[PDB]
Amino acid sequence: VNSFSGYLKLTDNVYIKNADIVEEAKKVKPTVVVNAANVYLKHGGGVAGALNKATNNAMQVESDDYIATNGPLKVGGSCVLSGHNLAKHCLHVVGPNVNKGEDIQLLKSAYENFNQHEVLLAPLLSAGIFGADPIHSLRVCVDTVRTNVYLAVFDKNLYDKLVSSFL
């Protein structure tokens, strides 16, 4: 049994809810929250900007030190950093950004990072300002992630379309 409430069960391991990822993290304090990161861990907008704002910029300060030591992530890659006030850990995952011309086949590689964590609160990778089709992102998630994933969707309209169209 876990703390996650109000989710729609899609499969054995994937759950979905219309919720503010920030507000959901603050309520649950999950072991892992996933950030929709870029390779530079520059948390300007979208999910990343919202998560970072909720940490009062501590996520960005920590991320800048990580990049200064390790250099950029790979598209499809990830790193584990602090979850600050939101979670124990933040898994920063880089999905391909279609608005930069990145290979959408890297979306599966991105979701494979979730399999290193038994339970996660996450957004749909490469959705929103990353430019991919969220219906496609949900399909790759279900067909890739084997661990227990609780997906938070920012828009009620998109949430309802994802559920109605789910095979």
Ligand X SMILES: O=C(O)c1ccc2c(c1)OCO2
CB of 64 to ligand X, least distance (A): 21
Q: For residues 120-139, which are near ligand X according to CB under 6 A?
A: 123, 127-128
154 binds ligand X (CB under 6 A): yes
Minimum CB distance to ligand X smaller for 111 or for 154: 154
Minimum CB distance to ligand X smaller for 27 or for 146: 27
Q: Is 49 helix (H, G, I), strand (E, B) or coil?
A: helix
Q: Decide: residue 74, CB within 10 A, 0-12 exposed, 13-18 middle, 19+ buried.
A: exposed
Distance CA 91, CA 37 (A): 9
106 binds ligand X (CB under 6 A): no
Distance CA 121, CA 21 (A): 8
Sheet with 14-18: strands ordered across: 8-9, 14-18, 148-153, 119-122, 32-36, 89-93, 78-82
Minimum CB distance to ligand X smaller for 30 or for 128: 128
CB of 154 to ligand X, least distance (A): 3
Minimum CB distance to ligand X smaller for 10 or for 51: 51
50 binds ligand X (CB under 6 A): yes
Minimum CB distance to ligand X smaller for 76 or for 95: 95
CB of 70 to ligand X, least distance (A): 26
Closest CA to 18 of 133, 131, 134, 100: 134
The one-letter amino acid at 17: K
Question: Which residue is nearest to ligand X, using beta carbons?
Answer: 128
54 binds ligand X (CB under 6 A): no
Closest CA to 109 of 127, 90, 96: 96
Instruction: Kindly list the residues in this chain that would bind ligand X in the complex (CB under 6 A).
Output: 22, 46-47, 50, 123, 127-128, 154
